[PDB]
Amino acid sequence: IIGGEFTTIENQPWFAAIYRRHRGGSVTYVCGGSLISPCWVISATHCFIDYPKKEDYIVYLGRSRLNSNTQGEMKFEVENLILHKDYSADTLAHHNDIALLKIRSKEGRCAQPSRTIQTIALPSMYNDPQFGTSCEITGFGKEQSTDYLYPEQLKMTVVKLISHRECQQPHYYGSEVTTKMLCAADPQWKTDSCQGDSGGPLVCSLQGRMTLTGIVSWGRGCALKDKPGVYTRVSHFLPWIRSHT
Ligand SMILES: Cn1cc(-c2nc(C(=O)NC(=N)N)c(N)nc2N2CCCCCC2)cn1
């Protein structure tokens, strides 16, 4: 997250922190995700496509820091890694960049909701907020495009939804953006998602309910003028989600 503010898991208790085991035992951060039911986390396919083996991954819930434990956190193995069959990557844009992880503990249990662990509602189909609506994004991704490290403390910021028509201008993304994607950005291009925020939540208030409107997917640079963040449009994938859960 470029700009924005530091936060803790209580302000985004559906946030899932996804790591991968190596090859000798080191564990490194991969991507964010969102808890949509006790046993299911939703994220982006591009996070897993190069290492599509479920046994390689670890999911934490209730975690506010990257490389230290948070009191009350839960750790899970991945019982099921479901990547979207129609995924594709061109140079910049990822199509159908959506993935489901079924989580199970060594004790074989799903998530127990607590003060630091809650689910997030999915939207109703084809129902998103209007352009210019302010939404929030959360993650452990870079604080600057040039950074080598990820922040140790969770961050969040606010971005405004951009119209498909605006996003498709050549100056923006041209045809790279489809109707199954959403664009969002700061009016000053001052704050944004970045590398390491992939898979995490774009949350909007719809009908007075916090709703998983988007999943961080891609962008050209971070917080660059005319280059919004691009998000998987969750309201266009509900059958896929429902079928696979
Ligand atoms: C040098 N480099 C990378 C990025 C990057 N950016 C984003 C991103 O969300 N960008 C944005 N909202 N403007 C992203 N989801 N993934 C990224 N990457 C790049 C794609 C390949 C690995 C994932 C990290 C930005 N600058």
Asked if 5 and 24 sit in the same domain, the reply is no
Q: How far, in Å, CA of 124 to CA of 17, rounded?
A: 25
Token output for 47: 């996070």
Instruction: Answer yes or no: do 3 and 98 share one domain.
Output: no
Q: How far apart are the C-alpha atoms of 233 and 214, rounded to whole Å?
A: 5
Quick one: DSSP state of residue 209?
A: E
Q: Which residue's CA lies nearest to atom 22 of ligand 1?
A: 195
Domain count of the fold of the chain: 2
Q: Determine whether the shortest distance from the Cβ of 222 to ligand 1 is under 6 A.
A: yes
Q: Which stretches of the chain are assigned E, i.e. beta strand?
A: 5-6, 15-21, 27-37, 40-43, 57-61, 74-83, 88-89, 94-95, 99-104, 134-139, 155-162, 181-185, 201-206, 209-218, 229-233
Residue 131, amino acid: F
Domain that holds residue 67: 13-119+236-245
DSSP three-state, residue 46? helix
Q: Which of 34, 43, 94, 97 is catalytic?
A: 97
145 CA closest ligand 1 atom index: 26
Residue 84 a catalytic site member: no
Pocket lining: 64 vs ligand 1, CB cutoff 6 Å:
no
As a whole number of angstroms, the distance between CA 231 and CA 15 comes to: 16
Helical segments of the chain, H only: 164-167, 238-244
Domain co-membership, 91 together with 131: no
Reply yes or no on whether 46 is catalytic.
Answer: yes
Shared domain for 72 and 124, answered yes or no, is no
Q: Produce one character per residue of 144-160: b if its CB has 16 or more CB atoms within 10 Å, e if not.
A: eeeeeebbeebbbbebb
CA atoms of 33 and 36, how far apart (whole Å)? 9
**Between the CA of residue 125 and those of 15, 97, 164, what are the distances in Å?**
22, 18, 17
Q: Is 195 in the pocket of ligand 1 (CB under 6 A)?
A: yes
**Cα(85) to centroid of ligand 1, in Å?**
22
- One domain, residues 135 and 163: yes
The three-class DSSP label of residue 65 is strand
CB of 144 closer than 6 angstroms to any ligand 1 atom: no
Pocket test for ligand 1, best of 97, 222, 230 (most atoms within 8 A of CB): 222
Q: Are residues 144 and 96 part of one domain?
A: no
Number of residues that this document lists for the chain: 245
Same domain assignment for residues 215 and 195: yes
Residues 200 and 113 in one domain: no
Query: Is residue 221 in contact with ligand 1, taking CB distance under 6 Å?
Result: yes
CA-218 nearest atom, ligand 1: 15
Same domain for 178 and 215, yes or no, is: yes
The reply to whether ligand 1 has any atom less than 6 angstroms from the CB of 216 is yes
| 141 and 71 in a common domain | no
In whole angstroms, give the CA distance from residue 160 to residue 38. 30
CB of 229 sitting under 6 A from ligand 1: yes
Nearest CA to ligand 1 atom 18: 195
Looking at residue 30, which CATH number applies to its domain? 2.40.10.10
Helix then strand then coil, in percent of the chain rounded to 5, is: 10, 40, 50
Distance (Å) from CA 73 to ligand 1 centroid = 27
| Cβ neighbours, 10 Å, residue 66 | 16
Task: Let me know whether 18 and 6 are in one domain.
Answer: no
Q: At how many Å resolution was this determined?
A: 1.9
- Residue 225 contacts by C-beta under 8 Å, 6 or more apart in sequence? 189
Measured distance CA(62)–CA(87) in Å, rounded: 29
Q: Which residue has the tokens 């009016």?
A: 187
Q: Are residues 219 and 245 in the same domain?
A: no
